Write an enzyme that holds these catalytic residues in place. Structure first.
Site, PDB file in Angstrom:
ATOM      1  N   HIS A   1      -5.196   2.774  -9.277  1.00 26.97           N
ATOM      2  CA  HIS A   1      -5.388   3.449  -7.992  1.00 26.97           C
ATOM      3  C   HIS A   1      -6.299   4.660  -8.146  1.00 26.97           C
ATOM      4  CE1 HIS A   1      -3.499   3.761  -3.797  1.00 26.97           C
ATOM      5  NE2 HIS A   1      -4.487   4.637  -3.811  1.00 26.97           N
TER       6      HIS A   1
ATOM      7  N   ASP B   1       1.264  -0.114   1.737  1.00 25.38           N
ATOM      8  CA  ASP B   1       0.453   0.105   0.559  1.00 25.38           C
ATOM      9  C   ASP B   1       1.155   1.012  -0.443  1.00 25.38           C
ATOM     10  OD1 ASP B   1      -1.484  -1.471   1.877  1.00 25.38           O
ATOM     11  OD2 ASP B   1      -3.051   0.008   1.565  1.00 25.38           O
TER      12      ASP B   1
ATOM     13  N   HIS C   1       2.535   3.027   4.256  1.00 24.13           N
ATOM     14  CA  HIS C   1       2.955   3.184   2.864  1.00 24.13           C
ATOM     15  C   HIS C   1       4.476   3.173   2.825  1.00 24.13           C
ATOM     16  CE1 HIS C   1      -0.903   5.015   3.600  1.00 24.13           C
ATOM     17  NE2 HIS C   1      -1.232   4.744   2.348  1.00 24.13           N
TER      18      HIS C   1
HETATM   19  O1  LIG Z   1      -4.862   3.623  -0.916  1.00 26.16           O
HETATM   20  C1  LIG Z   1      -4.622   3.479   0.267  1.00 26.16           C
HETATM   21  C2  LIG Z   1      -5.395   4.085   1.313  1.00 26.16           C
HETATM   22  C3  LIG Z   1      -4.776   5.180   1.676  1.00 26.16           C
HETATM   23  C4  LIG Z   1      -5.208   6.021   2.775  1.00 26.16           C
HETATM   24  C5  LIG Z   1      -4.234   6.439   3.647  1.00 26.16           C
HETATM   25  C6  LIG Z   1      -4.551   7.214   4.736  1.00 26.16           C
HETATM   26  C7  LIG Z   1      -5.864   7.555   4.965  1.00 26.16           C
HETATM   27  C8  LIG Z   1      -6.832   7.112   4.091  1.00 26.16           C
HETATM   28  C9  LIG Z   1      -8.134   7.463   4.324  1.00 26.16           C
HETATM   29  C10 LIG Z   1      -9.123   7.053   3.463  1.00 26.16           C
HETATM   30  C11 LIG Z   1      -8.801   6.281   2.377  1.00 26.16           C
HETATM   31  C12 LIG Z   1      -7.491   5.924   2.135  1.00 26.16           C
HETATM   32  C13 LIG Z   1      -6.513   6.345   2.996  1.00 26.16           C
HETATM   33  N1  LIG Z   1      -3.568   2.740   0.642  1.00 26.16           N
HETATM   34  O2  LIG Z   1      -2.702   2.507  -0.425  1.00 26.16           O
END
Ligand SMILES: O=C(CCc1cccc2ccccc12)NO
Ligand SMILES: O=C(CCc1cccc2ccccc12)NO
Ligand SMILES: [Zn+2]
Ligand SMILES: [Zn+2]
Ligand SMILES: [Zn+2]
Lengths: 205, 206, 206, 206
Positions: free
Chosen positions: B63, B9, B163
């Protein structure tokens, strides 16, 4: 080996059918009831306890932001416990978190829960019954059976189902056969029998 | 038959092409949810992810939680992302992946619009927590990230949140790929024709 | 082939010329990381350090933790430090030594810019702890800092944090060259074509 | 000659007596830096930490960076927190632990007042980072915190930063005590009689 079937978000239209199916296979189960559904189905609530099943809570709003981010969890389980007590005349302690305890049940709220008297239980097996909502119930049920039988490997097992769904209720029959074939017993949860099953491995809960 | 869907992501980003080579080396296919600002900065790398057999999906323009969910520009932004991705890879993907996940931003209304627009929505079933390991030796962060993913891969399908815009993350993919297939997982991309739902709302129209 | 890399931070300063004599007397080579205002005020010592076989790298402009790391000027400050040094030795050195060390202020973004701008980053494996002994009797402090360095020297490669702006440190440079060679160590300057990583993030691009 | 100084910040807390028992069980001593607001809420644990052979020093009153450093209330807060702790254990402790570290908040101005007000200041040489493992199984957070602390204990003295106000932190001190012991460490509290400086400013006045 013991197999604890749990059902969420009820009672509902098919709860009564599910209770018959359990009665006939001499099976006991665990029910996490939403407040508004105990206000509407008092007889089902009262029947569930009456026929040897545990009756725990699953909150008032089943709303993620209210319970966890605005910290209302314990409050709406206490209220839910109150309503259930006004039927079965005891106050159950075990709770099942809407959407599970990870990650919404933060350290501050797990303290409130241990403080307030409550336990928390998650699951070991997700039947994934919600995948098959609104498709041919016979087949939808046969597949949710497959999912859980496929994952029945552990000595103790706690299974997430939902008795507000035709598909899920329809396949309790096959699950009972496959699991008792694998040597499992089918008991309901009880408060002195309590060992921790929570995604945080918080053994206070 | 177990299969593990590695998802990455917030890309593309500066470690993406290395990620793309570690994937390539263990014949492993994966899924990328991209931000449009980085669709525009790294177009070669979207072109490439696609050309190597990976699903390329949207993860919004801004985002920005307030703009996405409170103001309801979710479907607006995933369609814009759609547009840019298509002009590069010549196909309009349908799967999205909500910034900060579907719960609780994607209310019932926005969920209806998502359905009304042809889009699907994916959350995940394992959260590597990769981006939270930004204050340690990278070798050490990758190994805990891997421990995280490995000890939670237990179901036939797993959708693993990562990510590709953090070095500790791409550093862990090697050990993740070795451990999961020791456990009997294959590493496939999301196939659009073979969609099965994975959302926090348990909504199977998505 | 034990190799011991003596490192001297925050100079040149008033005891630097004494150090340069002691090193040449033992035909020892070292590394000096210099602050820009010490370069503006001691150009001769800088020219001399390079001239007698020492690598001359940078320690930034302000030695100010907020500006370098929280306001993101590190690379900008190492660049202007490199020009000032380039104007005296006619080289443009690559090796940087972060004030207060790489961890944790050299975040994933800055380490992109360091890699992008040409620079390496180097920490240490041995903290002389010469700063504890400030403004205490120099001989006793010195014999003490030697004990610190002598005792922790144990692997084939070592990089030793010392400060040539402090008297007790320079005073103990003889007692360090004694026992470290005894243990089989040779004393070289950092050679840029011989670059390996020694950084707390274990970030191998630096 | 190996000592490990276990520090615990932001207490006392609801997991602190648990932690107090685990220390007793290994007859291991440690150091506690306290927020005054928790001094007031958990006074039995304050005099109990002290009564079991642990150093009770000050964190702040507000743990507020803007008030502590930008407005310079650091020493004011340490002195007030001092009084509270004294009224409970009859000692006026002298060691302080800065919220968020002395770097960069304790500037030369404030460090002057610290030195003139009789106080000492301790930072740390290992940062367990325990408080970041808030989003995982607790047992697994303990283990990654134990791996962190275990793998960095290499210097003769080591000052270990944890917070007794998080379940994952206390849950890790079993593994930590066992591992450091095997690595040859004794577990002692800070004694004022034997003070040596440990700060990021390298200021041996404090
Ligand atoms: O935007 C995102 C989500 C990212 C993300 C990463 C790790 C924990 C998370 C907990 C709650 C919400 C989003 C989280 N991915 O790009
Ligand atoms: O005072 C402390 C701080 C430790 C610490 C260091 C660096 C950044 C931080 C950010 C948020 C919280 C604590 C931080 N421990 O008690
Ligand atoms: Zn539910
Ligand atoms: Zn310096
Ligand atoms: Zn603190």
């Amino acid at each position: 080996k013991v197999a604890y079937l749990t059902f969420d978000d009820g009672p509902g239209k098919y709860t009564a059918e599910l209770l018959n199916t359990l009665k006939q296979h001499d099976a006991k189960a665990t029910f996490f009831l939403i407040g508004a559904n105990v206000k509407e189905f008092p007889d089902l609530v009262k029947r569930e306890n009456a026929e040897g099943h545990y009756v725990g809570m699953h909150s008032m709003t089943h709303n993620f932001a209210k319970l966890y981010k605005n910290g209302e969890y314990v409050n709406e389980m206490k209220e839910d416990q109150g309503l259930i007590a006004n039927i079965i005349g005891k106050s159950p302690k075990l709770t099942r978190p809407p959407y599970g305890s990870m990650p919404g049940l933060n350290e501050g709220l797990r303290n409130k829960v241990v403080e307030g008297g409550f336990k928390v239980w998650d699951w070991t097996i997700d039947s994934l019954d919600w995948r098959y909502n609104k498709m041919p119930v016979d087949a939808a049920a046969a597949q949710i059976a497959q999912n859980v039988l496929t994952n029945a490997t552990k000595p103790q097992e706690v299974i997430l189902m939902h008795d507000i769904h035709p598909q899920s209720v329809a396949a309790v029959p096959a699950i009972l056969k496959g699991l008792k074939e694998k040597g499992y017993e089918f008991e309901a949860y009880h408060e002195e029998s309590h060992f921790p099953v929570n995604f945080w491995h918080d053994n206070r809960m | 038959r177990k299969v593990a869907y590695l998802t990455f992501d917030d890309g593309p980003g500066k470690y993406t092409a290395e990620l793309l080579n570690t994937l390539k080396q263990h014949d492993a296919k994966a899924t990328f949810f991209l931000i449009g600002a980085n669709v525009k900065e790294f177009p070669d790398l979207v072109k490439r992810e696609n050309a190597e057999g990976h699903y390329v999906g949207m993860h919004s323009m801004t985002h920005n939680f307030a703009k996405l969910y409170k103001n309801g520009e979710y479907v607006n932004e995933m369609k814009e992302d759609q547009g840019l991705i298509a002009n590069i890879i010549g196909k309009s993907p349908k799967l999205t992946r909500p910034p900060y996940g579907s719960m609780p931003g994607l209310n019932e209304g926005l969920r209806n619009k998502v359905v009304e627009g042809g889009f699907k929505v994916w959350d995940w079933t394992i959260d590597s927590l990769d981006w939270r390991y930004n204050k340690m030796p990278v070798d050490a962060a990758a190994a805990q990230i891997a421990q995280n993913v490995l000890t939670n891969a237990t179901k036939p399908q797993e959708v693993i949140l990562m990510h590709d815009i953090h070095p500790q993350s791409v550093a862990a993919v090697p050990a993740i790929l070795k451990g999961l297939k020791e456990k009997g997982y294959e590493f496939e991309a999301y196939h659009e024709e073979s969609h099965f739902p994975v959302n926090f709302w348990h909504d199977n129209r998505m």
